[model samples]
Every structure is written in structure tokens, then in C-alpha cells.
Target: GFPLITITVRGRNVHMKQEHLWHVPLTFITSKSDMVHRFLLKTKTDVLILPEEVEWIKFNVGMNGYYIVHYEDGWDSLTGLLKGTHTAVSSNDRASLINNAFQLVSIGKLSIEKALDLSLYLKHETEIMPVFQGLNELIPMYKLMEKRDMNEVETQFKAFLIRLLRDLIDKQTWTDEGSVSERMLRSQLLLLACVHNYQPCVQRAEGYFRKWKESNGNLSLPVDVTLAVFAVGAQSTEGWDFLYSKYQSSTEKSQIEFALCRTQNKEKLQWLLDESFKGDKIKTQEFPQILTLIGRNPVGYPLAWQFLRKNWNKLVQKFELGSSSIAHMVMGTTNQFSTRTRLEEVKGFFSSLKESQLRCVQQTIETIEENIGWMDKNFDKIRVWLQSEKLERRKF
Candidate 1:
């Protein structure tokens, strides 16, 4: 009843003396059904007449081929397939659907709701690829919510994430389980869950951290779960000191330092920031990295920016005057700023410096403007959608 468009490859030129166009084959599966039809795109634009009314047309079958697909019937049918009858679709195609849906939303060709609706299937997903692919897309948007300080929106988003991840999160144990990929997924899931304030993840990770600490750091925690445990334990004032003390004594320093960066406590972060310049605690080589890690935390954004402003002269004197370190630091602290007022403040402060000294200035300004525009356009819609999602608010 309708024509579907797709691209594919099947044949190759066999003539030894001269070559010709290769034949390509593509398959189309009828919507809400198991029947499949194969077709080859013979020209730049070609069409296939379906046996019956085709609700949607999927391109790049098996995701073996690379192409952007536009669903003539919107995403509702595909969402249904993913949610109610997920096994009807192949896992590779599932990943393609999630990837393309988000890309389309980013490019303004698809609605955010469509992509998010498709995302609800994530709860049922047991495979690592599809779940991680979905998280890979969702986490950046969640970070946007964090950077903008949209409390209710962030809360609801975390609730939605927990809802999607609860089953798998509950299933994963500290000991290695399932395939190698599944173990990777467990660590990632637990880390994300802990940060989102999922009580079980927090309680488990903190218990691990406490065990490790009580042993005077001698009883080693599993390396895979260390970041997750450190993230949960580093939130308390006492925990921050413990991590700091560990950092001071340990030569294997990366995880402890990063765990220190994950703290959301204001006074603790400020103490770390103040200590970074003292030369003995945080080495000169590590200063920029410290600033970057600090800036990456939502709570540290404003503090990092203010500290950068206060220490501009000192920073220049310490690092090479013409080096990119300052520029990198500038970018880290100010990149998340998403308001006109913050933009003006950034511009006003940077205007005092030479263009050569602050190469990232233009890019930072553009990024801030992009953040503002994106938030202005999408925040309210996202907020409304999240609030309307009826996902239970599981208190942690």
C-alpha cells in the first residue's frame, strides 16, 4: 500500500578488463509483523511497493550498513516494538534505533519526546550494548540539567534513570558475574546509580569503602568497584578527609584524586581548591588537572570560575605565561555557564587578557551561548515530560 526507500549492497563487478556497478540488497521488515521483504536501491532515489500497508520503513538492516533513516510513520511503531515485543527486533537494530533517534533529535529533525519514548525500552534491555548506548546519549543531557541547576528537573531525570536501571542494578553483585561486557556494565551501572542517589548502590558501595578503610587500606576492594565506592564515601566531610589522607599516603593516586573530585560538599571542594596552589599537597604538574576535575562537578562550576578569577595573576605567574594550561583551565571552569549574565561576566573578565593568552576564549563564549540557547529551547519541554512520566519517586 506504500513505498519504502532504503540502500544496500549485494553484487560486485567480476569483469577482469573492465568494472561495472556492484549490486546491493537491502531487506525491509513489515511493521508489527515477522514478514520481511528484500529490495535493492537501483538509483539515487528508488522505491519499493509493499505487500500491505507499511506503518514504517527501517533502513540499514542489521545495522551492518551505515545510513540515517527517517521513519515515515514517526517513532511510535518502533517504540512499541522495543517496549512490548523487543525480541521482534534484532539487538543491533535496537542500538541503531537508539543512536539514530538521539542524533535526529540533536539535529532538530525529530522530537525529543520521540527519542525519550523510544528510550523507555531501556528498562527491559539485558544486553550491554543497547543499555550503554542509551546511557551514552542520556547522560550528557542529564549533565545539562545539572549544569543549569534545574533541581526538580534533575531530580525527576534521576528518578527516571533509576526506574530504567533498577532491575539490572539490583541484579548486579560486587563479584564478577556474567560476560566480561556484563561486568563492565555492572560497574558503570553501579557508578551511575550511586551518583543518582539510588540507596542500594550507595549503601553497598559505602559498605565496601568502609571495609577498605577500616582495614587501613590493606584489604583491597575490587578495582572495578573502587570508583563507585569512593564516589559514595567521599560525600561526607569525614570521608573527604579520609580520601585526602589516603591521597597523601598513596602512590597509586589517580582513583583517590578523582574520587575526591566527585564530592559535592562545598567546603570540602573549597579546601581542595585552596590547597592546590600550596605546591606541597598538589604538585604544579597536577594543578590544571585538579582544576579540570573540580570544574567537571556541577557543584564546583561556580566555585571554579570564581577561583579562576581570583587567581588569574597567580595562575599566570605559576604556569607559563603563554601556555595553553591557562586556556584549558579557563575552558574547564566556564564551559558550563549557560546564562547571559554569566556570559557577560566571562567576557568581561577575559577581556582584560590578550587573545594570545586565552585562545579558548572565543570557543568558550560560543559554547556558553550554545548552552543558553539549548536550555532555553528544550528545558521546559523536558521538565514537563519528566514531570508527566509517572515513574515512582523511589526515595533513596
Candidate 2:
């Protein structure tokens, strides 16, 4: 007959001040054919030996016969936690799981089997997309945090972000463009940066933009992606510059530029206005309303008025271009009227123009507006969709 033998072991790190122990247990079945079996337990204190040759010492140790292996020194609580966490979780989850694993690692009672089980559990349970979103949620809070907390947050956030990025790149999802669903993965990454105020996110976004540019010089992205990213820079003067440079020919660029001018970057809005008018591509009559919209901001009003007075003929011509375009561009410029009222004002402006001219302008305005709006709303989705259809790179 064979008896079941159980052995317990523990160890600790020698370098850390706060000593901690890890416990491992093993069970073996022994048969009469084997006269003796050797058991070795290595601990911080010394090597422990159990031999069949020794006479059984019946000292009557109380409780169940479980031997305690203690590590007198060389155990670090944090280091143990790091090892446990690293082996168990994906890199994305390491930050949150470290403390939990540390408690067990420090106890010095964690078995090798249990550690291996934990590693498997974490591997299957990790959700990288959610972790990235969680990191985004933590970013704003990190900004308000003190230096120490901020550092911790930054470290964790960066790690998770990098993991998510690597996954996206590895899966080839970054190149996917066309449909909303197809682009959502990449869009999510961009949104993470926009919401988090992470400068690296912007740099990454620029890389994506550049990729698009190389393939198609327009480099236009989805409207939602652009709008969300635009929100991040909505208040910065340089933000307009970023938009203009990246999406100068994009359909939504004009509206986005105008929106920024009327709201956050009024100081430099005139330059945009001047540029928009420089090309014969855009008519002079469009300038006055554009200027009027830009004028709503006090910083922009003087320049707007000066431009208006300096170019009265052009300004007058702008009003002749029919009211719909004016309304569309200037609807959100002022608080005095709702968007509908602005639209009505635009209709009234063209009410006096000749029917033929008004009709031509109206058709042109509607077509342009629809095209711009479509580009604004669907470009990213469309691009991603196209990518998906062609490349089959679907990871979100």
C-alpha cells in the first residue's frame, strides 16, 4: 500500500526591507517498491531535509500535521506582487492587478499550481479595448492629481495605451478604413487620445493622418473622428492650424475652421478668412457672412468689420450668393438666434436677388453643403469600410 505525502515550501526576496513569503505545496503517492523518497525544501533560512531513515519523533505537535516553512529574510512584498501580476495578467491589466497579487505573493503561501492557474485566468479574462477606455477615463483625473499620483497614473495609462496600440498594429486594424464599424477600432484609438489629453495620442493620430495622406493626398478622416478630435483642440489657436494643414481640402474643413474662428481662436481667424477668399475657388460674396460669423467673437469683430469695409463690393456680392450657405455657415455663430432663425435670415438675404441667380446659387449651395456634410459625417466610416472590404482587417 502507498501513503499520500504532502510537502509545503516558502521563499522570500533578500533585497527588500519588507520581507514577504511565498508558499508552495506538493503531494506525492509513495509505494512499497520505493524504499525511500527524498524531499527537499529550500527556504531563506536554510535547506530543509526530510529523510525516511530518521526515527519518527513524536513530540506531539498540536493541530493537523502541516509543517510551517518560514523565510527569515530576503522577501520583498512589492517584488513578489510584480512577479505574480506579470505572470498572470496581460500587460494592460498589470497595473490594476499588481496590488491584489502582491498580497498573496507576500504571504509566501502561493503554490506554483495556483500561480499558474492565476496566469491562465488573467490571460482569458483580459479585455484590452475596455482597458484602453478605462485609461482614457483616468487621464483627466490624472491631470488634476498631485505629482506622485500623476506619475502612477501616467505610468499605468501609458502601459495600457501602448498595449492597445500594439494589438491594433499587430491585428492590422490601423489600416482598415471605410465603414463606421470597420473604422471604429482606429476611431476608438483616436478618441482615446482626444479625450485623454495625451500628446502622444496626437502624434499617433498624425501618423494615421500621414498614412492616409500618402495614399490619398486629401487625408480626410471620418466626420465623427474629426469632430471628436477637433473637440480636444477646440480652444487652442494652434488647433485651427492643425486642422487646416491636415484637412485643408476636406469638406468639413471650412465649417470646422469657421466654428473654431467664431469660438476659440478668434485672434487668428482673419488669416483663415483671408485664405478662404484668396482663391477664385471661393466667391467674394461668401466673405461678409463668414466675416460676420467670425466677427461675433470680440477679438474677431474689428478685423471682420475692417475686412467688410475694405471689401464692401465683395461683401455685397456675398449676400447675393443666396442665404442658405450663409445660414449654414453662420448658424452657430451668435446666441441671439437659433439655427432656424439664422437660416431664415439667410433666405431673406437672397430674397431680393434675381430669381435666376438665386436659383443657381441655391442649387450650388445645397450640393456643396450636402457633399461637405456627407464628407464630415461619413469619411472616416467610409474609409474604414473600404479598408475592411478590401483587406479584411477587422479588429475593434
Candidate 3:
């Protein structure tokens, strides 16, 4: 019969008394009139909202016994609550609204602050960041679900990550310049890009790379940043050549160690070779894997083969004796696979590789029937031996 929601003395937008959502009285909702603030809903009462799309919304607890819904039309004390509905919003509708707002913010159509504010009429979903950071009971369950396979959404997964990194890369993250946090943020980004071989991120790191190298008038980059720079640079001819000429072997070695520490096995082999093998004069551990990375790239092969010549005794033992190194070695020659590849069994390992991985292995192949006498005969000798071994294993 009367206005259930009213405001005679319109509170100043200047500074409404800030209050917590859970502090409101039972049986009613609170808000800054029809404006500037949030609404309180009675707790535990099933409700349905009227609007279908909104920026965002949040609802949780701390009040009950009322069906108060924002009709957008409110009371001015005199006109009464403008003809409105006191219905609750469906759970599905609430999700739809929040998701719409989420997408708006995610895509760039809306600002984060605006989306955050839109949910004011609901409960306190605004506290999501903190809740996620400290989701009390939900945290444990979330950890388990985090391991779910996403083959179903790989494309979306990649798109989301790329955009996320792009936003950070474009933001004022470096505004403070000398701030360690800013630099480290860049370092962390670069490191992950290398570990994942995420090309877009690697390209983006070029900016951070330039800035880092220029920090003190062409001063070398920090350990972490330099590590990232080399990881990216190693992927191309010009890249490795440029890094090889500019940095000290000591620093380059550190790049290998740093990058290697960040990734797992097979990926680590790539790191060890690209970053560790760039210097032509260094004597490092010889891996059957590095043999392929360099054997394929002409600029790298000469020295790489020379490295093999120097370690022939050690390498012969690896292929002829090591249980798995032979396959690892054969697989690295995927690039050379198209030409006269014996023991078709090795092709299985090559087929297992992703395009990028296949490209690298393929880059160095003729891991078999080629090499044109450029490689030491022992290398070929081991190659033949592996083929026979593979054939034997295949039972032919």
C-alpha cells in the first residue's frame, strides 16, 4: 500500500556511507536509492531478476524474508516505488548477466571497473578476486579440476592466453622503469614464452628485450631477461648469429642453464642445444639431441659435427649402448626424414611430434642416409647401427 523503497534526502554522491553487504538487516535490501550504490537482497530467498543483460552482478548472503527486486524505477518518497515488480532473477539469468559482463570486459567492449560496478545490485560477487585468492573451501576443489584435459578447447585456450599476455605486454607495467617488480614481470613473461615456445609472446618480448638491453646504455640484460632473449634468438639463423656475436660465452651459457631449468625433458634438450650450442668453441656435454639441431642448420652443423668428432667415443657409446638415446637421436633427424629413411620405425617418433617440434627435428635430419661425407663416418656408422637395431626391435 506504501513505498517500500524510498529516499527523501537523496544522499550525496560525494561519499555515501560505505557499508558491507553482509551487514544489512534481514527482510530487506539496501542501496543508494535508485543509483550510485548497491542493493541488498534477503538471504536464502529464491529470487528472479527482471533484466536479462547487465554489466555484472554478485549475490551471496546475510538477509532474508523479502522479494525485493530493482525495477530501475524507485521511490522519491513522494511518488512511491514506481510501478515495479518484486520478482527474483533466475539463477540462469544471473549467470547470463555476469557472463555477458565478463565477455564485455574480456573482449574490450567494456572497462573492468564498469563491469565490476554493474554487479552492485546483486550481492558481493565483487569480492571474487579476493575470494579466488582465498576461496576458503573452494580452493582445494579447484586445484583438482585444474588438471582437466582441454583438448576440447585448445584453440580458445591459446587465444585467451595470447590476449592475456598481449594486454599485460601493452599495459603500463614498465611505467616505473627501475622498479624490480616491473622488470621481473617482463622476465617472467619472457621465460614462460621460451618454455612454451609461444611465438607471439616471443615476438612481443622483443620490445622488453630492447628496453632491457638498453637499460644502462647498451648494458647487458639481467640474467633472466638475457636468458629469454637467447631462447628466442636461438630459434632463427639471424637470431643465434646476432646473439653469438654480441654476448660473452659465459652469459650465453647462463641462458642455457636458466632456460633449461625452467622446462621438462624433451623441451630441455632443445634449450640445451639452442642456448648452449650457439658458441662454436665451447666444450659442453654432447647430447644425441643437439646433434640433430645443428646437423640440420648449415651455420651450426660444421661446428656441431666437429663437436661430434671430438666426442665420438662418448657418442658411440650413447647410440650403440644407451637404451633410449638412439631413438631420441633418430627422432631429431625428422627434417632429413623425407629422404631415404631406413627403419621406418623411426618415423613413428617423428610423427608424434607437433608441427613446430617436427620442424626442428626435420631441420637436421638425414640423421640417416645423407650427410655427404661432411659428418664423421662414425656418426654414420652409429646411424646404420641404430637402423639395424630399430629393425631388429620391429622384428623384421
Better of 2 and 3 by TM-score: 3
Residue 111 of model 2, lDDT score:
31
Q: Is candidate 1 or candidate 2 better by TM-score?
A: 1
Writing each residue's lDDT as its tens digit, candidate 3 over 1-396 gives: 111221112222111121113323322223322222344433422233323333222222221222122212222221111112112333333343344333333333344343333332332222222212212221221121122232323333333333334444333232325455455556555554444456665674566555544553265455546656656545544445444345445455555433332322334334445444344443334455456554443233334434543444555453453335544544443323222333243344444433324432344444333332222222233233323322323345
Ranking by TM-score: 1, 3, 2
lDDT of 1 by residue, 330-390 (tens): 8889887778988999888888765533468878998888878777877888888887678
Sort by lDDT, best first. Answer: 1, 2, 3
Q: Could you tell me which residue pairs clash in candidate 1?
A: 9-24, 10-23, 10-24, 11-23
Off by over 4 Å in 2: 1-173, 181-200, 206-267, 278-316, 336-396
**Model-by-model lDDT, in order?**
0.74, 0.39, 0.37
Q: How many backbone clashes does candidate 3 have?
A: 20
Candidate scoring better on TM-score of 1 and 3: 1
The top-ranked prediction according to lDDT is 1
| Tens-digit lDDT string for candidate 2 (54-101) | 211111012122332222221133234333533332343343332222
